[PDB]
Design a protein around this motif. Structure first.
Motif, short mmCIF file in Angstrom:
data_model
loop_
_atom_site.label_atom_id
_atom_site.label_comp_id
_atom_site.label_asym_id
_atom_site.label_seq_id
_atom_site.Cartn_x
_atom_site.Cartn_y
_atom_site.Cartn_z
N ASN A 117 34.58 46.37 43.96
CA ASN A 117 35.24 45.23 43.35
C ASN A 117 35.98 45.68 42.10
O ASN A 117 35.55 46.61 41.41
CB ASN A 117 34.21 44.15 43.00
CG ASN A 117 34.81 42.77 43.00
OD1 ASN A 117 36.00 42.60 43.25
ND2 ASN A 117 33.99 41.77 42.71
N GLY A 118 37.10 45.04 41.81
CA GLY A 118 38.00 45.61 40.82
C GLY A 118 38.66 46.81 41.46
O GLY A 118 39.01 46.79 42.65
N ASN A 119 38.83 47.88 40.68
CA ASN A 119 39.30 49.16 41.21
C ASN A 119 40.65 49.00 41.92
O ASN A 119 40.76 49.14 43.14
CB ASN A 119 38.26 49.77 42.15
CG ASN A 119 37.06 50.28 41.41
OD1 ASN A 119 36.95 50.13 40.20
ND2 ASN A 119 36.13 50.89 42.14
N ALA A 120 41.67 48.66 41.14
CA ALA A 120 42.98 48.35 41.69
C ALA A 120 43.54 49.51 42.50
O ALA A 120 43.38 50.68 42.13
CB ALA A 120 43.95 47.97 40.58
N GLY A 121 44.20 49.18 43.60
CA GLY A 121 44.82 50.18 44.45
C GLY A 121 43.99 50.63 45.63
O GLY A 121 44.34 51.64 46.25
N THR A 122 42.91 49.93 45.95
CA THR A 122 42.03 50.30 47.05
C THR A 122 42.16 49.28 48.17
O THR A 122 42.18 48.07 47.92
CB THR A 122 40.58 50.37 46.58
OG1 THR A 122 40.48 51.25 45.45
CG2 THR A 122 39.67 50.88 47.69
N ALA A 123 42.26 49.77 49.41
CA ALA A 123 42.40 48.93 50.59
C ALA A 123 41.25 49.19 51.55
O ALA A 123 40.85 50.34 51.76
CB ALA A 123 43.73 49.19 51.28
N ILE A 160 46.13 42.04 51.15
CA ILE A 160 45.53 41.91 49.83
C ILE A 160 44.75 43.16 49.47
O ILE A 160 44.17 43.84 50.34
CB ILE A 160 44.63 40.66 49.79
CG1 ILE A 160 43.58 40.72 50.89
CG2 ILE A 160 45.47 39.41 49.95
CD1 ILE A 160 42.56 39.62 50.82
N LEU A 161 44.74 43.49 48.18
CA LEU A 161 44.02 44.63 47.64
C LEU A 161 42.91 44.15 46.73
O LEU A 161 43.01 43.08 46.13
CB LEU A 161 44.96 45.55 46.84
CG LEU A 161 46.00 46.36 47.59
CD1 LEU A 161 46.91 47.05 46.60
CD2 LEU A 161 45.34 47.36 48.49
N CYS A 162 41.84 44.94 46.63
CA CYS A 162 40.79 44.63 45.68
C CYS A 162 41.20 45.06 44.27
O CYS A 162 41.68 46.18 44.07
CB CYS A 162 39.48 45.31 46.10
SG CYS A 162 39.49 47.10 46.01
N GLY A 163 41.02 44.17 43.31
CA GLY A 163 41.41 44.44 41.94
C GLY A 163 41.12 43.25 41.06
O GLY A 163 40.63 42.21 41.51
N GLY A 164 41.43 43.41 39.78
CA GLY A 164 41.20 42.38 38.80
C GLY A 164 42.35 41.40 38.71
O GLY A 164 43.34 41.50 39.43
N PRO A 165 42.24 40.41 37.81
CA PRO A 165 43.34 39.45 37.64
C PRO A 165 44.63 40.08 37.15
O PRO A 165 45.71 39.61 37.52
CB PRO A 165 42.77 38.45 36.62
CG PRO A 165 41.75 39.23 35.88
CD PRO A 165 41.12 40.13 36.90
N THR A 166 44.55 41.13 36.33
CA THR A 166 45.75 41.74 35.77
C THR A 166 46.50 42.61 36.77
O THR A 166 47.69 42.87 36.58
CB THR A 166 45.39 42.57 34.54
OG1 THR A 166 44.42 41.86 33.76
CG2 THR A 166 46.61 42.82 33.68
N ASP A 167 45.84 43.05 37.84
CA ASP A 167 46.45 43.99 38.76
C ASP A 167 47.07 43.27 39.96
O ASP A 167 46.83 42.08 40.20
CB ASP A 167 45.42 45.01 39.23
CG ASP A 167 44.92 45.87 38.09
OD1 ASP A 167 45.50 46.96 37.87
OD2 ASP A 167 43.95 45.47 37.42
N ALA A 168 47.86 44.02 40.72
CA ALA A 168 48.64 43.47 41.83
C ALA A 168 47.75 43.37 43.07
O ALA A 168 47.38 44.38 43.66
CB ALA A 168 49.86 44.34 42.10
N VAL A 169 47.41 42.14 43.46
CA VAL A 169 46.54 41.95 44.61
C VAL A 169 47.28 42.22 45.91
O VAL A 169 46.74 42.86 46.82
CB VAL A 169 45.94 40.53 44.59
CG1 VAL A 169 44.88 40.39 45.66
CG2 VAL A 169 45.34 40.24 43.23
#
Lengths: 493, 247
Positions: free
Chosen positions: B25-31, B110-119
């Motif tokens: 969870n979080g960790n932007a850029g992971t599919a 959709i990608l896993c990431g936080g609110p600030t990152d590109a879902v």
């Protein structure tokens, strides 16, 4: 090599990314044992999950056909009421049971804990005539254990869904769980136990309806106009649930179904208690459940232009007639009962008759204004929470009031188009407005339909000695009321 | 750790999916891509990678990762309740649906990431391309011209050099010229200049600073340029609803 960031550095991000959901407006609290106590669960889906015989499908079928005079609800929810004492359970949503437990004939080990480990002996399911046989064989190996819960434990398998369920022997108290072991021949993955999200249900007492609805609203509250819909409830239970509903000011609706004679017995207990609706049934007839009419009308509304609507003049061909005399209707209206009335209009004969709720003078008697206030509260709360989540900080100065008003402006703009703000004729109301707001000429403004204020005061909270600030706002608007009676005189010559 | 540079595709089973999305969870850029047990390998984690690789950033290249068909890959989920459970974990899969007799396509971008990152993955790819293009243009400017003075000519020259990249960005589809009040207030607060939100009519807003500072490595004062760019992201419609009123 030296990284490029020594010379050029670029940071990418998304601004104002914080998503805040939008509140939706029916939920049914059933008693059947399919639904675990601690969860809340878009008509064919209901048919598949519950079966054709269940009352849930019966309700969903009539619920999902609706036009609302502006061409549908599109969702429904179910929760669990613990009617009687329950044993601990462990309950498998993934499609399984393709009859491919083969290869688990090699001495299967599974581990389960009440409070300490219990390992189960070799379980061989190579034969596996059916998954019913698999459940029986698992049960036989579990019952060999000497723990009181596992002495008479039961394992069952469900075909409509794909769930394996394990029930302990003792009723009232106990905690059960299953652990993921490291052995090769461990069937906690072929079974859906201890994988992904598994519902472990601890033992419970007989429980009470008002506590059950609170537990259900704890997990999610994206609904409106709940109802129980089982066997008829006792009058005291209805009283307790209506009181609990009245505890929250203007959040939910609560629909009850009564007979004609029982109506007089109520309206004494549930007098006041804002947000409660009473619907009269027909004795010695088909069920043709009627308490769902206000819930359906609320669910179908989409808050597009001209969506205020009116709960009075609307037709329900499925429901059967309730009253047909003027004196009987006069007696019924004293108790604020809602019904389907039949009247002759040049030969043709049926419609919902009253849109009134039981409550005090301060609360919204009509259901349309009740629904509109629900929507206003939800929309304002959503906008304010989204503001808090996105922008860096909100200063406690003139910029703060300006920014808050600017953010609240679109919601109030949409409210005028919806029909919840009416731009309507009293002197008493004028004096009340001039007294409540220090600013005179607010009543002339409420020409436009609304009046808004912002305060931004400071205070100290009780939890910590620190001074924390706060914003206070007051909103006044003209409610949306619909005409219900027409009178006139035709003077000739 | 690197903000918006790479993507990382993982393949999981259905049961293991719930175990993940707690760790990652979080960790932007992971599919996360769901496999099919007891079937051919028919490796599926390559679908987002292939779609990204094939893109050529020519006009109308923004694309959408949702509605796209993979006949080689086999079906993953076929029930609405199973899809509802899977979507909670942000899993990507091939779904099958009936449309007048005919039966399969990738379902979520959709990608896993936080609110600030590109879902969404399309905006992720477009931001990758923007960062690379801007860095290339600035490095090329540094390498070619003799010197960049720290005066008005400096801001003018830097803006002139960055202009063609932003011109191409509008044609590509990464800049959309789109309807909130909260976003308006955020823009007016982040940038001291009001009426920037009206401009972001055109799709973007750019600024240059050219301040000075002293680096830690040596006592000497070295200058530097600070720029801020705001643009409307490119989002695609995914749901259609309507009512047909007769008479």
């Amino acid at each position: 090599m030296i990284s490029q960031s020594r010379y050029i550095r670029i940071i990418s991000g998304v601004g104002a990314g914080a998503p805040v959901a939008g509140r939706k407006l029916l939920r049914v609290m059933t008693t059947n044992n399919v639904i675990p106590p601690g969860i809340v669960i878009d008509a064919n889906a209901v048919l598949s999950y519950f079966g054709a015989q269940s009352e849930e499908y019966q309700r969903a079928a009539a619920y999902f056909k609706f036009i609302s005079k502006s061409v549908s609800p599109s969702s429904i929810s179910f929760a669990r009421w613990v009617n009687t004492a329950i044993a601990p359970m462990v309950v498998d949503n993934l499609p399984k049971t393709i009859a491919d437990f083969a290869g688990f004939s090699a001495g299967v080990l599974t581990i389960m804990v009440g409070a300490a480990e219990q390992n189960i002996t070799a379980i061989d399911t190579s034969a596996a005539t059916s998954m019913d046989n698999v459940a029986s064989i698992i049960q036989t190996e579990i019952r060999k254990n000497a723990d009181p819960q596992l002495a008479q434990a039961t394992v069952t398998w469900n075909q409509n869904t794909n769930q394996f369920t394990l029930v302990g022997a003792t009723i009232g108290t106990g905690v059960l769980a299953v652990a993921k072991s490291a052995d090769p021949q461990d069937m906690s993955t072929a079974l859906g136990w201890s994988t992904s999200n598994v519902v472990n249900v601890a033992g419970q007492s007989a429980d009470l309806p008002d506590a059950a609805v609170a537990k259900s609203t704890n997990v999610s509250n994206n609904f409106g106009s709940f109802l129980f819909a089982g066997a008829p409830l006792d009058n005291d239970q209805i009283k307790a649930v209506s009181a609990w509903n009245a505890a929250q000011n203007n959040q939910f609706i609560y629909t009850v179904a009564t007979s004609l004679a029982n109506l007089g017995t109520l309206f004494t207990l549930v007098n006041g208690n804002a947000g409660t609706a009473l619907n009269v049934l027909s004795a010695t007839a088909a069920n043709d459940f009627v308490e769902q009419c206000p819930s359906e009308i609320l669910a179908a509304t989409n808050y597009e232009p001209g969506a205020s609507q009116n709960y009075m003049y609307y037709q329900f061909p499925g429901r059967n007639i309730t009253v047909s005399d003027d004196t009987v209707a006069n007696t019924v209206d004293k108790s604020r009962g809602n019904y389907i009335g039949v009247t002759q209009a040049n030969g043709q004969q049926a419609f919902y008759q009253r849109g009134i709720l039981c409550g005090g003078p301060t609360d919204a008697v009509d259901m349309n204004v009740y629904a509109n206030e629900i929507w206003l509260k939800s929309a304002i709360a959503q906008a304010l929470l989204d503001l808090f989540l996105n922008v860096n900080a909100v200063p406690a100065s003139s910029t703060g009031e300006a920014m808050t008003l600017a953010v609240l402006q679109p919601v109030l703009d949409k409210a005028t188009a919806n029909g919840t703000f009416t731009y309507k004729e009293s002197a008493v109301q004028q004096q009340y407005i001039t007294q409540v707001t220090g600013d005179r000429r607010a009543w002339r403004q409420v020409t436009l339909g609304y009046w808004i204020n912002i305060t931004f005061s400071s205070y100290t909270n009780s939890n910590t000695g620190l001074t924390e600030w706060k914003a206070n706002y007051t909103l006044i608007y003209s409610k949306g009321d619909a005409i219900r009676f027409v009178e006139g005189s035709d003077v000739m010559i």
